[PDB]
Design an enzyme around this catalytic site. Structure first.
Site, PDB file in Angstrom:
ATOM      1  N   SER A  76      -2.974 -12.342   4.076  1.00 45.55           N
ATOM      2  CA  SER A  76      -3.435 -12.149   2.686  1.00 45.55           C
ATOM      3  C   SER A  76      -2.463 -12.751   1.660  1.00 45.55           C
ATOM      4  CB  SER A  76      -3.713 -10.670   2.413  1.00 45.55           C
ATOM      5  OG  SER A  76      -2.535  -9.941   2.584  1.00 45.55           O
ATOM      6  N   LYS A 134       0.819  -1.216   0.000  1.00 48.21           N
ATOM      7  CA  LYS A 134       0.000   0.000   0.000  1.00 48.21           C
ATOM      8  C   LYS A 134       0.862   1.279   0.000  1.00 48.21           C
ATOM      9  CE  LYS A 134      -3.520  -2.586  -0.367  1.00 48.21           C
ATOM     10  NZ  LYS A 134      -4.940  -2.476   0.065  1.00 48.21           N
TER      11      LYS A 134
END
Lengths: 293, 285, 279, 266
Positions: A257, A37
């Site tokens: 994830s 991110k």
């Protein structure tokens, strides 16, 4: 001296030869914020800076990583950062945000990301702080269209059969998908991953799940479905198991994830040739989850 | 060649929000999250070549060397047993279990030596093994030299094993001679290199309380001490002012580097190392 | 902004799988001056600057690529560069040197002008350039797995600096093989002679040559070097010079004596377009 | 994957000895010695996936695109046939025969994979290498691939915040709406508007005189030590004019398409 600009991106890809040598994993933990991110965060902030939108700082809803990236870039670049995040996200995220000097507002677990968004909008109104809006901001997709995808294409020697990625905001799969479909057309398969317990992309109902960082509970406005060939679900325990397996077998310290992505990539690779090349992403690192993994 | 390709080639950042004379090499980018990935790799590669690892590896460690060894062992198929003082951050214990290493908590060298006798497991010996120094002579030092555009006034580093300062120091002295100052850093509470007595301290990663056999003093010009509190404070400062999520020894190195920079010109270029990352210390920092 | 510092080095290695997949070639033409010599030229000049030796500029006698490297760095860094060169070296060299602003004409010049001689065959910084850049690069690029490193000797800087690093890591587990022309087999104990392998075979043993890291010397015929240079362009698409052909020809001989899985590394010192008049 | 790995990822240098507002991307670092390795690679890879190369490649040449195709064809095992005007440097002629050049046409002026090479490699490189801070990108147009692919990326990121400036010869100012003519700036000024040229991302066209380009190429070699070709002189001459209109702190990026040793005869 452009610190964050220079540090963010250009991450390595490794072949998972101890699990399945058809799977190639892009290690986004190498970013300075410890996750993928950092890329969309930087792009969104740079756009907001250019347009003069940050006089009162930033407020953004997050599942943890986008908030960490924003908090880090704000610390360096001089922006006040306020984050909203559901109380169900790993406590490591809270402590990192504090270390970076961001202000954190926890929101009710049962309201998920929708609850975080609503509280961010309220804080924006009270403070004048600017919401970048990771679910709607085109610069999220652009970060991956102009950095991540280009990286993958070249790192893989322009030979890819499939790209597999969990959808949180959908920025990763949209930006990478655009590049890869641009180059390969239907010679490449783009596969979205979501939780079995919250299969909204597959046309199902949102639900509580443990795969932190994916399965927002709604379809993000930025998700480019035109580049996606199919959607695969992953169970909570399959994601956790694979994350543990990656550390044990490959020595790769990746988060939940990442487990989900690799579990999905394995299913994708098993459905095709012995020389298939399937690329996925490890969004962040295992030490952001020691409390639960 | 996964670990071969992943380890090293870490970035350097200039600390413009703290003091623009300080340049910090971010060793958390390594796959094991620390600088110790480099010596762990070199030592393992040498031991493999020499046929020493068929009974696995046993090493007593502060943490990062153990994590590096455990990681490389997990990938390359070596059993890894570690003995580690209980005082080291608990993050290390969970990380070591995830990597499949067998841990015995405890100086602790006695236990590691005991285990070696009982199992045949091979001790790499991070304090004695020349391949620790070679890792920095052939990767870290050459990286720093080029990354700094062949312009360095000082290189400052904490000494744990002494590998980093010795291997980097050899390259830098080779290129600059007397034109570069090499400064070793140790804890005020255990100023062994300065000629004082060993003591307990909280700067995790440095200050072993003895002079490592691999320490190449011929490349070191001076020794500087740092207080435990200075180290913690600077670590927090790096996160808050630079957005850099670095550990305790990174605070110690940058606190020392600032002292060194302050003694030099406006345009001095002082390089140091950030050995690991802040998330390894959430329980204490 | 340290232009030359940033551009020099970090060259790629390619596996020659259309010729012999055991041979790995480091493409030194990627350097801004088009040759390996950019590295020692940079190191020697930075040392000389540090030591205040360049008030009256540089004068150096050369076969060519060192002259190009020195001319280029001098042009950028603001040093007068005077060069002296043998006429038997490619003419393409003379034009390039003038383009870079070198004054073409050493001891007498140095005495008369005060211009400083870098002394490429005697200067330890030539070796250091390879000990601190080329060698470290090779070791990591090759995933720490090398059976042999093969390289022609001009000044001997490349083989010395790389060999120090590879011997450090591998010990006797790596073979370091010097290459020289069959027509000038000086390292092999023979007499110097005229030959066509531009860039190697100076006709004497350089002072900087570190013979302690070298395991064997192999020779190559002039015709072997030319044929392999042409072969590299035609089969691999690699536009490399004559000394590159010499190095690969030698590396092939070395590989053929080893197993099917040997990894033999060599260097391509420069590019083919520096030899159009002759290759 | 030899050619895949070697092509691209070229450096940018700041031209501090000429004008520190100008940043030059050094495409001679590519294995074929020019920027054209990028589109040649992409067009060849696309043709291979589509099964179009059983009988090899045949294509039109100003020079560098021919070298790039011949190189890649040599390595990847494709027969390569080419055609070129005798007005181009004889250095090119020897290089092509070195690479074994003497069937599918790639069509460099019409093939979208030319633009894609720059959209997916060159543009992304430039954006990152410049720390996401660019006031103008200036590039000569040969096929228009470079300006179109880089332009798409930089317009996506900066919008009207970046100026994209096309360069052509004053002697053949076709993109400016003038008439074609013979000129000496090898590698640009084809004398027509290429099909692939993305006019939606270009803000203006600037012309350069033949002597301007030559003087500047010689200047780059003498002042910066950069052994660049004639079209690199043209590009920097143009970037200088662009930077001069923008003021003190402007960041103006351009490209050095090839190397000086390909033009020793001129």
């Amino acid at each position: 001296h452009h610190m964050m600009e220079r540090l963010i991106g250009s991450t390595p890809i490794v072949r998972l030869d101890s699990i399945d040598s058809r799977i190639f994993l892009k290690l986004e933990k190498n970013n300075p914020g410890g996750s993928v991110k950092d890329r969309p965060a930087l792009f969104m902030i740079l756009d907001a800076e250019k347009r003069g939108l940050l006089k009162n700082g930033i407020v953004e809803p997050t599942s943890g990583n986008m908030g960490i990236a924003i908090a880090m870039i704000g610390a360096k670049r001089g922006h006040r950062v306020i984050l909203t995040m559901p109380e169900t996200m790993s406590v490591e995220r809270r402590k990192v945000l504090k270390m970076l000097g961001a202000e954190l507002v926890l929101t009710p677990g049962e309201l998920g990301m929708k609850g975080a968004v609503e509280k961010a909008l309220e804080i924006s109104r009270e403070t004048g702080a600017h919401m970048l809006n990771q679910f709607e901001n085109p610069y999220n997709v652009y970060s991956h269209q102009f950095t991540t995808g280009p990286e993958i294409l070249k790192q893989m020697d322009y030979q890819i059969d499939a790209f597999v990625a969990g959808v949180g905001t959908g920025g990763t799969i949209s930006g990478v998908g655009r590049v890869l479909k641009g180059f390969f057309g239907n010679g490449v398969k783009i596969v979205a991953v979501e939780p079995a317990k919250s299969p909204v992309l597959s046309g199902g109902q949102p639900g509580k799940h443990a795969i932190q960082g994916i399965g927002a509970g709604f379809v993000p406005k930025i998700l480019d479905r035109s580049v996606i060939d199919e959607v695969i679900t992953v169970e909570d325990e399959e994601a956790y198991e694979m994350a543990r397996y990656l550390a044990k077998k490959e020595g790769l310290l990746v988060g939940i994830s990442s487990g989900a992505n690799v579990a999905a990539a394995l299913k994708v690779a098993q459905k095709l040739g012995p020389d298939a090349r399937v690329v996925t992403v490890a969004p962040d690192h295992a030490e952001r989850y020691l409390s639960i993994l």
